[PDB]
Write an enzyme that holds these catalytic residues in place. Sequence first.
Site, PDB file in Angstrom:
ATOM      1  N   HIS A  33      95.906  -4.109 -23.787  1.00 44.57           N
ATOM      2  CA  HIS A  33      94.487  -4.351 -24.117  1.00 44.57           C
ATOM      3  C   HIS A  33      94.529  -5.645 -24.816  1.00 44.57           C
ATOM      4  O   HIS A  33      93.790  -6.555 -24.721  1.00 44.57           O
ATOM      5  CB  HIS A  33      94.379  -3.062 -24.984  1.00 44.57           C
ATOM      6  CG  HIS A  33      92.992  -3.211 -25.799  1.00 44.57           C
ATOM      7  ND1 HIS A  33      91.719  -2.693 -25.407  1.00 44.57           N
ATOM      8  CD2 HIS A  33      92.573  -4.125 -26.736  1.00 44.57           C
ATOM      9  CE1 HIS A  33      90.650  -3.104 -26.102  1.00 44.57           C
ATOM     10  NE2 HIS A  33      91.155  -3.853 -27.014  1.00 44.57           N
ATOM     11  N   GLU A  34      95.363  -5.783 -25.971  1.00 43.35           N
ATOM     12  CA  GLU A  34      95.523  -6.797 -26.788  1.00 43.35           C
ATOM     13  C   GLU A  34      95.584  -8.000 -25.957  1.00 43.35           C
ATOM     14  O   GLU A  34      94.858  -9.032 -26.099  1.00 43.35           O
ATOM     15  CB  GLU A  34      96.439  -6.802 -28.050  1.00 43.35           C
ATOM     16  CG  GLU A  34      96.137  -5.621 -28.783  1.00 43.35           C
ATOM     17  CD  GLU A  34      94.922  -5.652 -29.383  1.00 43.35           C
ATOM     18  OE1 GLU A  34      93.787  -6.734 -29.417  1.00 43.35           O
ATOM     19  OE2 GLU A  34      94.277  -4.595 -30.031  1.00 43.35           O
TER      20      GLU A  34
ATOM     21  N   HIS B 219      93.067  -9.753 -24.033  1.00 48.12           N
ATOM     22  CA  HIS B 219      92.200 -10.455 -24.803  1.00 48.12           C
ATOM     23  C   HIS B 219      92.288 -11.738 -24.877  1.00 48.12           C
ATOM     24  O   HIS B 219      91.513 -12.830 -24.768  1.00 48.12           O
ATOM     25  CB  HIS B 219      91.945 -10.026 -26.293  1.00 48.12           C
ATOM     26  CG  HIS B 219      91.127  -8.832 -26.617  1.00 48.12           C
ATOM     27  ND1 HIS B 219      89.822  -8.914 -26.369  1.00 48.12           N
ATOM     28  CD2 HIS B 219      91.569  -7.683 -27.347  1.00 48.12           C
ATOM     29  CE1 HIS B 219      89.348  -7.742 -26.843  1.00 48.12           C
ATOM     30  NE2 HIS B 219      90.059  -7.156 -27.201  1.00 48.12           N
TER      31      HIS B 219
ATOM     32  N   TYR C  65      82.591 -12.472 -28.808  1.00 54.10           N
ATOM     33  CA  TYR C  65      83.047 -11.164 -29.303  1.00 54.10           C
ATOM     34  C   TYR C  65      81.702 -10.592 -30.029  1.00 54.10           C
ATOM     35  O   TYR C  65      81.826 -10.326 -31.173  1.00 54.10           O
ATOM     36  CB  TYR C  65      84.116 -11.314 -30.220  1.00 54.10           C
ATOM     37  CG  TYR C  65      84.873  -9.883 -30.492  1.00 54.10           C
ATOM     38  CD1 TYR C  65      85.433  -9.341 -29.162  1.00 54.10           C
ATOM     39  CD2 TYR C  65      85.139  -9.282 -31.468  1.00 54.10           C
ATOM     40  CE1 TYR C  65      86.114  -8.190 -29.056  1.00 54.10           C
ATOM     41  CE2 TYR C  65      85.871  -8.086 -31.319  1.00 54.10           C
ATOM     42  CZ  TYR C  65      86.608  -7.480 -30.304  1.00 54.10           C
ATOM     43  OH  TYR C  65      87.093  -6.505 -30.273  1.00 54.10           O
TER      44      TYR C  65
ATOM     45  N   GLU D 235      85.591  -5.981 -24.614  1.00 58.16           N
ATOM     46  CA  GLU D 235      86.283  -4.743 -25.004  1.00 58.16           C
ATOM     47  C   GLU D 235      86.598  -3.989 -23.752  1.00 58.16           C
ATOM     48  O   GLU D 235      87.816  -3.479 -23.780  1.00 58.16           O
ATOM     49  CB  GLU D 235      85.536  -3.946 -26.069  1.00 58.16           C
ATOM     50  CG  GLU D 235      85.743  -4.346 -27.607  1.00 58.16           C
ATOM     51  CD  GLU D 235      87.246  -4.349 -27.650  1.00 58.16           C
ATOM     52  OE1 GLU D 235      87.735  -3.084 -27.443  1.00 58.16           O
ATOM     53  OE2 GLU D 235      88.017  -5.210 -28.030  1.00 58.16           O
TER      54      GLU D 235
ATOM     55  N   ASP E   5      80.075  -3.158 -36.281  1.00 59.60           N
ATOM     56  CA  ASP E   5      81.143  -3.321 -35.156  1.00 59.60           C
ATOM     57  C   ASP E   5      80.594  -4.575 -34.199  1.00 59.60           C
ATOM     58  O   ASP E   5      80.571  -4.326 -33.035  1.00 59.60           O
ATOM     59  CB  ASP E   5      80.996  -1.980 -34.431  1.00 59.60           C
ATOM     60  CG  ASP E   5      82.481  -2.099 -33.166  1.00 59.60           C
ATOM     61  OD1 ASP E   5      83.372  -2.947 -33.351  1.00 59.60           O
ATOM     62  OD2 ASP E   5      82.282  -1.351 -32.285  1.00 59.60           O
TER      63      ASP E   5
ATOM     64  N   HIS F 164      82.813  -1.873 -29.581  1.00 54.13           N
ATOM     65  CA  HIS F 164      83.888  -0.848 -29.462  1.00 54.13           C
ATOM     66  C   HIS F 164      83.055   0.334 -28.966  1.00 54.13           C
ATOM     67  O   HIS F 164      83.726   1.276 -28.543  1.00 54.13           O
ATOM     68  CB  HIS F 164      84.983  -0.708 -30.583  1.00 54.13           C
ATOM     69  CG  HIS F 164      85.818  -1.762 -30.876  1.00 54.13           C
ATOM     70  ND1 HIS F 164      85.391  -2.700 -31.675  1.00 54.13           N
ATOM     71  CD2 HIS F 164      86.910  -2.101 -30.364  1.00 54.13           C
ATOM     72  CE1 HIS F 164      86.419  -3.666 -31.775  1.00 54.13           C
ATOM     73  NE2 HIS F 164      87.261  -3.370 -31.120  1.00 54.13           N
TER      74      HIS F 164
HETATM   75 ZN   LIG Z   1      89.819  -5.252 -28.196  1.00 54.43          ZN
END
Ligand SMILES: [Zn+2]
Length: 316
Positions: free
Chosen positions: A142-143, A146, A157, A166, A226, A231
Amino acid sequence: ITGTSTVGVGRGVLGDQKNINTTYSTYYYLQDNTRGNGIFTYDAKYRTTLPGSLWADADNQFFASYDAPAVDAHYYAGVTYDYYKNVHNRLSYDGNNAAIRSSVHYSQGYNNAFWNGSQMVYGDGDGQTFIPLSGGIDVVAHELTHAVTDYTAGLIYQNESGAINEAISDIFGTLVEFYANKNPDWEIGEDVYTPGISGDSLRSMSDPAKYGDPDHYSKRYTGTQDNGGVHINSGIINKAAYLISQGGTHYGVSVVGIGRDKLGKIFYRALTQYLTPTSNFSQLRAAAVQSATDLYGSTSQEVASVKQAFDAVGVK
Ligand SMILES: [Zn+2]
Ligand SMILES: [Ca+2]
Ligand SMILES: [Ca+2]
Ligand SMILES: [Ca+2]
Ligand SMILES: [Ca+2]
Protein backbone atom coordinates in the site's frame (compact mmCIF):
# COMPACT_ATOMS: atom_id res chain seq x y z
CA ILE A 1 27.54 0.94 1.70
CA THR A 2 30.06 -0.95 -0.44
CA GLY A 3 30.58 -4.60 0.39
CA THR A 4 29.76 -8.19 -0.39
CA SER A 5 26.23 -9.33 -1.22
CA THR A 6 25.05 -12.19 0.95
CA VAL A 7 21.97 -13.76 2.48
CA GLY A 8 20.90 -13.66 6.11
CA VAL A 9 18.09 -15.31 8.01
CA GLY A 10 15.57 -13.86 10.44
CA ARG A 11 12.11 -13.93 11.93
CA GLY A 12 9.34 -11.54 10.94
CA VAL A 13 6.70 -9.81 13.06
CA LEU A 14 4.31 -12.78 12.89
CA GLY A 15 7.04 -15.22 13.95
CA ASP A 16 7.69 -16.66 10.47
CA GLN A 17 11.25 -17.47 9.33
CA LYS A 18 12.61 -15.95 6.11
CA ASN A 19 15.79 -15.28 4.13
CA ILE A 20 16.81 -11.70 3.47
CA ASN A 21 19.35 -10.11 1.16
CA THR A 22 22.07 -8.35 3.13
CA THR A 23 25.43 -6.70 2.51
CA TYR A 24 28.61 -7.55 4.36
CA SER A 25 31.28 -5.04 5.26
CA THR A 26 32.52 -5.51 8.85
CA TYR A 27 28.84 -5.62 9.79
CA TYR A 28 25.94 -7.19 7.92
CA TYR A 29 23.62 -4.43 6.70
CA LEU A 30 20.01 -4.55 5.59
CA GLN A 31 20.92 -3.59 2.08
CA ASP A 32 19.66 -5.68 -0.82
CA ASN A 33 21.80 -5.18 -3.93
CA THR A 34 19.86 -7.67 -6.06
CA ARG A 35 16.97 -5.29 -6.87
CA GLY A 36 17.49 -2.09 -8.87
CA ASN A 37 19.75 0.42 -7.13
CA GLY A 38 18.96 -1.35 -3.88
CA ILE A 39 16.61 -1.81 -0.96
CA PHE A 40 17.79 -0.16 2.27
CA THR A 41 16.30 -0.55 5.72
CA TYR A 42 16.97 1.84 8.59
CA ASP A 43 16.63 1.90 12.36
CA ALA A 44 14.86 5.08 13.54
CA LYS A 45 15.51 3.99 17.16
CA TYR A 46 12.15 5.22 18.55
CA ARG A 47 12.85 8.77 17.34
CA THR A 48 11.20 10.80 14.60
CA THR A 49 14.33 11.95 12.77
CA LEU A 50 14.70 10.20 9.41
CA PRO A 51 15.97 7.97 7.99
CA GLY A 52 17.98 6.96 11.07
CA SER A 53 20.87 4.49 10.82
CA LEU A 54 21.32 1.89 8.09
CA TRP A 55 20.46 -1.35 9.90
CA ALA A 56 23.69 -3.08 11.02
CA ASP A 57 23.91 -6.58 12.48
CA ALA A 58 26.94 -8.44 13.83
CA ASP A 59 26.18 -11.99 12.68
CA ASN A 60 23.69 -11.93 9.71
CA GLN A 61 21.03 -13.54 11.93
CA PHE A 62 17.92 -11.51 12.72
CA PHE A 63 15.95 -13.33 15.43
CA ALA A 64 15.75 -10.63 18.12
CA SER A 65 12.24 -9.28 18.64
CA TYR A 66 13.74 -5.84 17.98
CA ASP A 67 14.78 -7.18 14.56
CA ALA A 68 11.34 -8.39 13.43
CA PRO A 69 9.90 -5.21 11.90
CA ALA A 70 13.16 -4.59 10.05
CA VAL A 71 13.09 -8.11 8.61
CA ASP A 72 9.57 -7.70 7.23
CA ALA A 73 9.99 -4.14 5.93
CA HIS A 74 13.12 -5.26 4.07
CA TYR A 75 11.61 -8.51 2.85
CA TYR A 76 8.21 -7.16 1.78
CA ALA A 77 9.76 -4.19 -0.03
CA GLY A 78 11.60 -6.82 -2.06
CA VAL A 79 8.41 -8.74 -2.83
CA THR A 80 6.64 -5.52 -3.84
CA TYR A 81 9.53 -4.63 -6.16
CA ASP A 82 9.30 -8.09 -7.75
CA TYR A 83 5.56 -7.71 -8.26
CA TYR A 84 5.88 -4.42 -10.13
CA LYS A 85 8.84 -5.65 -12.19
CA ASN A 86 7.49 -9.09 -13.05
CA VAL A 87 3.83 -8.25 -13.58
CA HIS A 88 3.88 -4.62 -14.84
CA ASN A 89 7.40 -4.30 -16.29
CA ARG A 90 8.06 -1.38 -13.93
CA LEU A 91 11.50 -0.91 -12.41
CA SER A 92 10.98 0.41 -8.88
CA TYR A 93 8.55 3.21 -8.11
CA ASP A 94 10.03 5.75 -10.53
CA GLY A 95 10.42 3.28 -13.39
CA ASN A 96 14.18 3.85 -13.31
CA ASN A 97 15.15 1.50 -10.44
CA ALA A 98 15.24 4.13 -7.67
CA ALA A 99 16.56 2.86 -4.32
CA ILE A 100 13.81 1.88 -1.92
CA ARG A 101 14.32 3.08 1.65
CA SER A 102 12.37 2.21 4.81
CA SER A 103 12.77 3.18 8.43
CA VAL A 104 11.27 1.09 11.23
CA HIS A 105 10.85 1.72 14.98
CA TYR A 106 9.62 5.21 14.13
CA SER A 107 8.65 7.15 17.28
CA GLN A 108 7.00 5.39 20.25
CA GLY A 109 3.71 3.51 20.12
CA TYR A 110 3.07 4.95 16.67
CA ASN A 111 -0.05 3.42 15.06
CA ASN A 112 0.68 4.19 11.44
CA ALA A 113 2.90 3.78 8.44
CA PHE A 114 3.44 6.17 5.55
CA TRP A 115 5.31 7.22 2.43
CA ASN A 116 6.71 10.69 3.09
CA GLY A 117 7.68 11.63 -0.47
CA SER A 118 11.16 10.05 -0.14
CA GLN A 119 10.91 6.84 1.87
CA MET A 120 8.68 4.51 3.82
CA VAL A 121 8.23 4.85 7.56
CA TYR A 122 6.75 2.22 9.92
CA GLY A 123 5.58 2.58 13.50
CA ASP A 124 5.67 -0.27 16.01
CA GLY A 125 2.05 0.24 17.02
CA ASP A 126 1.02 0.40 20.67
CA GLY A 127 0.56 -3.35 20.98
CA GLN A 128 -3.22 -3.03 21.26
CA THR A 129 -4.47 -1.31 18.12
CA PHE A 130 -1.46 -2.41 16.02
CA ILE A 131 1.62 -4.59 16.17
CA PRO A 132 4.57 -3.39 14.02
CA LEU A 133 3.04 -2.28 10.75
CA SER A 134 5.62 -3.76 8.39
CA GLY A 135 4.33 -7.21 9.37
CA GLY A 136 1.48 -6.65 6.92
CA ILE A 137 2.44 -7.23 3.31
CA ASP A 138 -0.69 -5.37 2.17
CA VAL A 139 0.41 -2.44 4.37
CA VAL A 140 3.95 -2.38 2.89
CA ALA A 141 2.66 -2.65 -0.69
CA HIS A 142 0.00 0.00 0.00
CA GLU A 143 2.65 2.50 1.11
CA LEU A 144 5.13 1.70 -1.67
CA THR A 145 2.30 2.12 -4.20
CA HIS A 146 1.91 5.72 -2.99
CA ALA A 147 5.42 6.23 -4.38
CA VAL A 148 4.35 4.78 -7.74
CA THR A 149 1.31 7.07 -7.77
CA ASP A 150 3.48 10.06 -6.84
CA TYR A 151 5.71 9.49 -9.89
CA THR A 152 2.89 8.78 -12.35
CA ALA A 153 -0.62 10.27 -12.03
CA GLY A 154 0.39 12.47 -9.07
CA LEU A 155 -3.08 12.36 -7.49
CA ILE A 156 -3.46 15.23 -5.02
CA TYR A 157 -3.97 13.88 -1.50
CA GLN A 158 -7.32 15.59 -1.12
CA ASN A 159 -11.05 15.05 -1.74
CA GLU A 160 -11.88 12.68 -4.62
CA SER A 161 -8.34 12.67 -6.07
CA GLY A 162 -7.05 11.61 -2.67
CA ALA A 163 -9.69 8.90 -2.32
CA ILE A 164 -8.55 7.47 -5.67
CA ASN A 165 -4.94 7.73 -4.51
CA GLU A 166 -5.90 5.74 -1.38
CA ALA A 167 -7.92 3.15 -3.28
CA ILE A 168 -5.08 2.57 -5.77
CA SER A 169 -2.81 1.75 -2.83
CA ASP A 170 -5.39 -0.63 -1.29
CA ILE A 171 -5.90 -2.31 -4.69
CA PHE A 172 -2.24 -2.95 -5.43
CA GLY A 173 -1.57 -3.73 -1.78
CA THR A 174 -4.13 -6.51 -2.08
CA LEU A 175 -2.82 -7.63 -5.47
CA VAL A 176 0.68 -7.92 -3.99
CA GLU A 177 -0.75 -9.91 -1.09
CA PHE A 178 -2.26 -12.31 -3.62
CA TYR A 179 0.98 -12.38 -5.59
CA ALA A 180 3.01 -13.59 -2.61
CA ASN A 181 0.14 -15.94 -1.76
CA LYS A 182 0.32 -15.13 1.94
CA ASN A 183 -3.20 -15.86 3.23
CA PRO A 184 -4.69 -13.55 0.59
CA ASP A 185 -8.01 -11.78 1.11
CA TRP A 186 -9.77 -8.52 0.15
CA GLU A 187 -9.23 -6.96 3.59
CA ILE A 188 -6.65 -4.31 4.50
CA GLY A 189 -4.22 -4.66 7.39
CA GLU A 190 -5.70 -7.76 8.99
CA ASP A 191 -2.29 -9.24 9.89
CA VAL A 192 -1.23 -6.36 12.15
CA TYR A 193 -4.49 -4.80 13.25
CA THR A 194 -5.84 -5.54 16.78
CA PRO A 195 -3.81 -8.62 17.81
CA GLY A 196 -6.43 -9.17 20.52
CA ILE A 197 -9.28 -9.59 18.02
CA SER A 198 -9.57 -12.24 15.32
CA GLY A 199 -11.29 -11.75 11.99
CA ASP A 200 -11.25 -7.94 11.73
CA SER A 201 -9.23 -5.44 9.70
CA LEU A 202 -8.78 -1.73 9.02
CA ARG A 203 -10.85 -1.64 5.82
CA SER A 204 -12.66 -4.14 3.63
CA MET A 205 -12.72 -4.02 -0.16
CA SER A 206 -15.33 -6.77 -0.50
CA ASP A 207 -17.68 -5.02 1.94
CA PRO A 208 -16.48 -1.52 2.95
CA ALA A 209 -19.66 -0.82 4.94
CA LYS A 210 -18.60 -3.55 7.37
CA TYR A 211 -16.55 -0.82 9.07
CA GLY A 212 -18.66 2.19 8.18
CA ASP A 213 -17.14 3.21 4.85
CA PRO A 214 -19.37 4.05 1.85
CA ASP A 215 -19.93 1.34 -0.77
CA HIS A 216 -21.91 3.68 -3.00
CA TYR A 217 -21.34 7.19 -4.36
CA SER A 218 -24.58 8.45 -2.82
CA LYS A 219 -23.11 7.67 0.59
CA ARG A 220 -19.89 9.61 0.03
CA TYR A 221 -18.45 11.75 2.80
CA THR A 222 -18.56 15.45 1.94
CA GLY A 223 -17.03 16.97 5.09
CA THR A 224 -13.48 18.13 5.80
CA GLN A 225 -12.00 15.42 8.05
CA ASP A 226 -9.33 13.05 6.76
CA ASN A 227 -8.50 15.55 3.99
CA GLY A 228 -12.06 15.38 2.72
CA GLY A 229 -12.44 11.66 3.41
CA VAL A 230 -9.55 10.12 1.50
CA HIS A 231 -9.56 6.96 3.66
CA ILE A 232 -13.37 6.96 3.77
CA ASN A 233 -14.51 7.46 0.17
CA SER A 234 -11.86 5.09 -1.11
CA GLY A 235 -14.41 2.45 -0.06
CA ILE A 236 -16.46 3.40 -3.11
CA ILE A 237 -13.53 2.74 -5.46
CA ASN A 238 -12.36 -0.33 -3.53
CA LYS A 239 -15.80 -1.94 -3.92
CA ALA A 240 -15.81 -1.22 -7.67
CA ALA A 241 -12.41 -2.91 -8.01
CA TYR A 242 -13.56 -5.85 -5.91
CA LEU A 243 -16.57 -6.20 -8.22
CA ILE A 244 -14.48 -6.02 -11.42
CA SER A 245 -12.28 -8.84 -10.16
CA GLN A 246 -14.71 -11.14 -8.35
CA GLY A 247 -18.13 -10.12 -9.65
CA GLY A 248 -21.39 -10.02 -7.73
CA THR A 249 -24.63 -8.09 -7.46
CA HIS A 250 -24.52 -4.77 -5.64
CA TYR A 251 -27.55 -2.54 -5.09
CA GLY A 252 -29.34 -4.56 -7.75
CA VAL A 253 -26.62 -4.20 -10.39
CA SER A 254 -24.93 -7.40 -11.59
CA VAL A 255 -21.24 -7.64 -12.49
CA VAL A 256 -19.36 -10.48 -14.12
CA GLY A 257 -15.92 -10.86 -12.55
CA ILE A 258 -12.93 -10.87 -14.92
CA GLY A 259 -10.31 -11.78 -12.30
CA ARG A 260 -7.34 -10.24 -10.45
CA ASP A 261 -4.79 -10.27 -13.28
CA LYS A 262 -6.96 -8.18 -15.59
CA LEU A 263 -8.01 -5.90 -12.72
CA GLY A 264 -4.33 -5.16 -12.15
CA LYS A 265 -3.60 -4.52 -15.82
CA ILE A 266 -6.55 -2.20 -16.28
CA PHE A 267 -5.85 -0.10 -13.21
CA TYR A 268 -2.10 -0.01 -13.81
CA ARG A 269 -2.73 1.37 -17.30
CA ALA A 270 -5.27 3.90 -16.06
CA LEU A 271 -2.80 5.02 -13.39
CA THR A 272 0.16 5.42 -15.73
CA GLN A 273 -1.50 6.63 -18.94
CA TYR A 274 -4.72 8.49 -18.18
CA LEU A 275 -5.07 9.70 -14.59
CA THR A 276 -3.98 13.25 -13.67
CA PRO A 277 -3.32 15.01 -10.34
CA THR A 278 -6.90 16.36 -10.18
CA SER A 279 -8.83 13.34 -11.53
CA ASN A 280 -12.18 12.76 -9.81
CA PHE A 281 -14.25 9.53 -9.59
CA SER A 282 -16.01 10.17 -12.89
CA GLN A 283 -12.67 10.64 -14.61
CA LEU A 284 -11.40 7.42 -13.03
CA ARG A 285 -14.34 5.59 -14.60
CA ALA A 286 -13.45 7.03 -18.00
CA ALA A 287 -9.75 6.15 -17.59
CA ALA A 288 -10.61 2.57 -16.59
CA VAL A 289 -13.09 2.09 -19.42
CA GLN A 290 -10.51 3.48 -21.86
CA SER A 291 -7.73 1.27 -20.44
CA ALA A 292 -9.82 -1.90 -20.75
CA THR A 293 -10.75 -0.77 -24.29
CA ASP A 294 -7.07 -0.39 -25.13
CA LEU A 295 -6.32 -3.83 -23.76
CA TYR A 296 -9.32 -5.96 -24.72
CA GLY A 297 -11.41 -4.07 -27.28
CA SER A 298 -14.48 -1.87 -26.99
CA THR A 299 -16.98 -4.75 -27.16
CA SER A 300 -15.10 -7.04 -24.79
CA GLN A 301 -16.57 -8.53 -21.60
CA GLU A 302 -13.82 -6.65 -19.76
CA VAL A 303 -15.08 -3.21 -20.83
CA ALA A 304 -18.63 -4.31 -19.98
CA SER A 305 -17.62 -5.44 -16.47
CA VAL A 306 -15.75 -2.22 -15.73
CA LYS A 307 -18.90 -0.32 -16.74
CA GLN A 308 -21.24 -2.49 -14.63
CA ALA A 309 -19.00 -2.19 -11.56
CA PHE A 310 -18.90 1.61 -11.64
CA ASP A 311 -22.65 1.62 -12.37
CA ALA A 312 -23.09 -0.58 -9.27
CA VAL A 313 -21.36 1.94 -6.98
CA GLY A 314 -23.11 4.89 -8.61
CA VAL A 315 -20.16 6.44 -10.42
CA LYS A 316 -21.17 7.84 -13.80
ZN1 LIG B 1 -2.44 5.34 1.90
CA1 LIG C 1 22.01 -10.71 14.81
CA1 LIG D 1 -4.31 -11.69 4.38
CA1 LIG E 1 -5.09 -8.20 3.32
CA1 LIG F 1 -7.32 -8.11 14.67
